[PDB]
Design a protein around this nucleic acid. Structure first.
Ligand code: SF4
Ligand SMILES: [Mg+2]
Length: 752
DNA sequence: TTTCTAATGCGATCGCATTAGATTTTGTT
């Protein structure tokens, strides 16, 4: 009645009776269109209202897609949000049984690093560590985000190296010195326990929290107080747990305590997901238990969705040959055969020319993409594709309109940042030449032996002969070019105007440096004609992050913009996307270009060779994640064999989550699919061989493969130091509503 | 003026000097 016909296998998902129910929805099978097809059957045929619908996904986009596919149906015939927004609401209502304060602020990944580095550099003690601060606060932030993901709380972690150190110093076969290092990493978790515990005593003293503590608190309000769960169960009568294969441990005992731990059988609960696209489990660190954790005391049912819609055959002969014999539920089926083209070339740039030529002979002769494992690898491929004659799509503080705004702001606060003086003296406004830069250094020296003398400097007061106090004192014009002396007086008169504004608020500097600079008039003149009036998106994204910050503009806002270049890779601004980047996007032409060794399989620090990894005795996934025995170990050559076999079991498990990146990057196909992998890398004396996946797939397609069958050491350079010149003649010669607007603007300027 | 890991391949199970790469990345009010 107004839509397409429902499939006969999808009807069991739709017309299932109320109760818990698990669906194994495979790849490309359109799971959302049969999540919304159960909301409609549970509204028009009774059993619920529109207001009693709850859906929970991870990403904020794939909740908005499900938000509309319910309301489009229910208007043709109403509460969808993420997991981490359902935690912040579950602590604004019930968040006083467990004593947290309401209206608690949430720290950014940068403003958390500001606070974590300040409790490491204020620790009274010894620490016995060969590391530096800013490298023992990358272990504090990595255990205390992994202790609050398995719900551990710092007391199960003390004295876990005992009954392992007793195994090496006893049992007389020295202790081989590979086994002391493994013993020295585990007396280092215990050593840093008072750092990841005086950090929580300060985040509770200022009432500010994180994302790994939202779900850690909301899952300790779940299983502890039954009353909070009962109110939620009454409010929502149908609950939709989409993407359940990526649900962590802390998110698992917060849903299985609220929504049906065997409690209610009138609630329509449905949870979808396949075990074989579990790519994200190295971050969340996570379904087989479903039907054992959401029971009636009978176990829960199980159904399947194996018809694949946006995927041709022969990408289901390759994807089913990769996934089977290692992992596999049951194989999925199609409903013309899309082609496969495999290749192997003796150079990266040759293999960047093979994948470009098949992508250029389908554009000048469709929806195309490139799926790469490494973020860095993108750039070269992009340039190559662009160069043939194809248009190509691919940090905020590296944008050249904000970078200039970051650079001339710093030169106002401290005149010892010389690396932001050569951003300005060599920039497009006031282009200096190499003779005037070197004439300013020689003035900057004119304005300026034993252990005590050597340590006298490296102070916060010592004078270092910097350039920026030779612009405010340039001398006489016999040292400079005659056109370059008018610019030193101009930039010295401009800075003294701006340096008197450090008493003003932090935002009104940034709005006055923006006016005095030629910004937001030269940023709009570098955009094409058909783009519109749009020039200042991410130059106005910056100027709301400076006001949401406030602040002192010298220590604050300049040592905040330096952590945020390190910690979160610039900031967030306003196809050659990576393989994690597209998980729900299907194109026509999909190329997976680099399948060499040490690249696509990407080989790795286990729990026994670094501090931060949590020992598998103590995590909530333990028997996967094989925990070692150490009971029959009555020797010391056994202990170097009962552990080295355990490391190879934790390292083969690393490889089984790389086939899942084949099975999730092959089934995004819908058409022809490209596969390649090079033979010489870029900087290797010995060439990198193709990975197992590519030599394995050449044994699948051989039962069409293109002709596969001392490195590249060339130099890349640059030289330092037109319609603009042509368009300047038109304005020189003369000197949509553009006539009356100028008459409006010249009124206010000419009216005192 | 410059760091650190887990490798590799000679020796006298192991020490012991020499050299390649540095991931991927959601989530509030
Ligand atoms: S030219 Fe290259 S090597 Fe020289 S300073 Fe610039 S980035 Fe560094
Ligand atoms: Mg020296």
């Amino acid at each position: 009645l107004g839509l397409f016909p429902p499939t006969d296998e999808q009807a069991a998902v739709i017309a299932a009776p109320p109760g818990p129910l698990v669906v194994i929805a495979g790849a490309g099978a359109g799971k959302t269109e049969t999540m919304a097809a159960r909301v409609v059957w549970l509204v028009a045929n009774g059993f619920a209202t529109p207001s009693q619908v709850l859906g929970l996904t991870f990403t904020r986009k794939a909740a908005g897609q499900l938000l509309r596919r319910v309301r489009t149906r229910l208007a043709r015939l109403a509460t969808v949000s993420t997991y981490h927004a359902f935690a912040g609401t579950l602590l604004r209502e019930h968040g006083l049984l467990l004593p947290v304060e309401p209206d608690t602020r949430l720290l950014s990944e940068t403003e958390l690093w500001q606070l974590a580095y300040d409790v490491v550099c204020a620790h009274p003690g010894h620490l016995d560590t060969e590391k530096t601060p800013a490298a023992v606060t990358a272990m504090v932030l990595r255990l205390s985000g992994a202790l609050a993901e398995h719900l551990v709380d710092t007391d199960q972690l003390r004295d876990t190296h005992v009954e392992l150190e007793r195994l090496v110093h006893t049992l007389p076969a020295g202790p081989s010195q590979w086994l002391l290092r493994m013993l020295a990493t585990q007396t280092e978790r215990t050593e840093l326990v008072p750092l990841i515990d005086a950090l929580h005593q300060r985040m509770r003293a200022e009432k500010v929290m994180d994302f790994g503590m939202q779900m850690a608190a909301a899952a300790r309000l779940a299983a502890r107080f039954p009353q909070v769960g009962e109110q939620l169960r009454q409010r929502f009568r149908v609950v939709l747990l989409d993407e359940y294969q990526d649900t962590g441990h802390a998110q698992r005992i917060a849903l299985s305590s609220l929504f049906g731990g065997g409690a209610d059988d009138g609630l329509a609960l449905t949870a979808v997901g396949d075990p074989i696209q579990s790519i994200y489990g190295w971050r969340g660190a996570s379904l087989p238990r479903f039907t054992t954790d959401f029971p009636y005391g009978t176990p829960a049912p199980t159904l399947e969705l194996r018809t694949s819609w946006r995927n041709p055959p022969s990408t289901l002969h390759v994807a089913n040959a990769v996934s089977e014999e290692a992992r596999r539920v049951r194989a999925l089926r199609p409903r013309e055969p899309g082609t496969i083209r495999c290749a192997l070339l003796n150079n990266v740039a040759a293999e960047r020319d093979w994948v470009a030529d098949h992508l250029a002979r389908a554009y000048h002769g469709p929806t195309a993409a490139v799926l790469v494992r490494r973020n860095a690898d993108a750039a070269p491929m992009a340039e190559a594709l662009t160069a043939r004659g194809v248009p190509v799509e691919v940090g905020l503080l590296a944008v050249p309109e904000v970078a200039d705004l970051v650079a001339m702001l710093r030169l106002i606060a401290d005149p010892t940042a010389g690396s932001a003086v050569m951003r300005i003296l060599t920039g497009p406004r006031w282009r200096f030449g190499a003779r005037d830069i070197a004439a300013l250094w020689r003035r900057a020296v004119e304005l300026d032996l034993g252990t005590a003398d050597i340590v006298a400097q490296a102070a916060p007061d010592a004078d270092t002969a910097c350039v920026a106090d030779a612009i405010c004192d340039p001398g006489d014009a016999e040292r400079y070019s005659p056109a370059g002396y008018e610019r030193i007086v101009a930039l010295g008169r401009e800075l003294t105007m701006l340096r008197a504004h450090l008493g003003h608020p932090l935002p009104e500097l940034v709005a006055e440096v923006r006016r005095v600079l030629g910004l937001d008039a030269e940023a709009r003149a570098a955009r094409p004609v058909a783009a519109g009036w749009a020039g200042t998106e991410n130059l106005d994204r910056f100027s709301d992050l400076v006001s949401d910050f406030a602040g002192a503009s010298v220590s604050a806002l300049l040592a905040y913009l330096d952590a945020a270049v390190e910690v979160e890779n610039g900031l967030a601004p306003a196809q050659i996307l990576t393989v994690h980047a597209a998980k729900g996007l299907e194109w026509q032409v999909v190329a997976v270009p680099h399948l060499s060794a040490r690249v696509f399989p990407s080989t790795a620090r286990t729990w026994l060779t670094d501090a931060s990894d949590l020992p598998p005795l103590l995590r909530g996934d333990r028997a996967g994640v094989p925990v070692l025995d150490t009971s029959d170990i009555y020797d010391r050559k056994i202990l170097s064999d009962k552990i080295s076999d355990h490391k190879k079991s934790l390292d083969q498990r690393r490889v089984d989550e790389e086939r899942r990146l084949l099975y999730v990057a092959i089934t995004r196909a819908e058409d022809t699919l490209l596969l390649s992998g090079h033979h010489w890398g870029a900087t290797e004396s010995k060439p990198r061989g193709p990975s197992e996946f590519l030599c394995e797939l050449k044994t699948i397609l051989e039962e069409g493969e293109i002709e596969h069958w001392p490195l590249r050491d060339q130099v890349v350079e640059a030289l330092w130091p037109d319609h603009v010149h042509r368009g300047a003649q038109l304005v020189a010669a003369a000197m949509e509503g553009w006539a009356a607007d100028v008459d409006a603007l010249l009124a206010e300027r000419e009216r005192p």
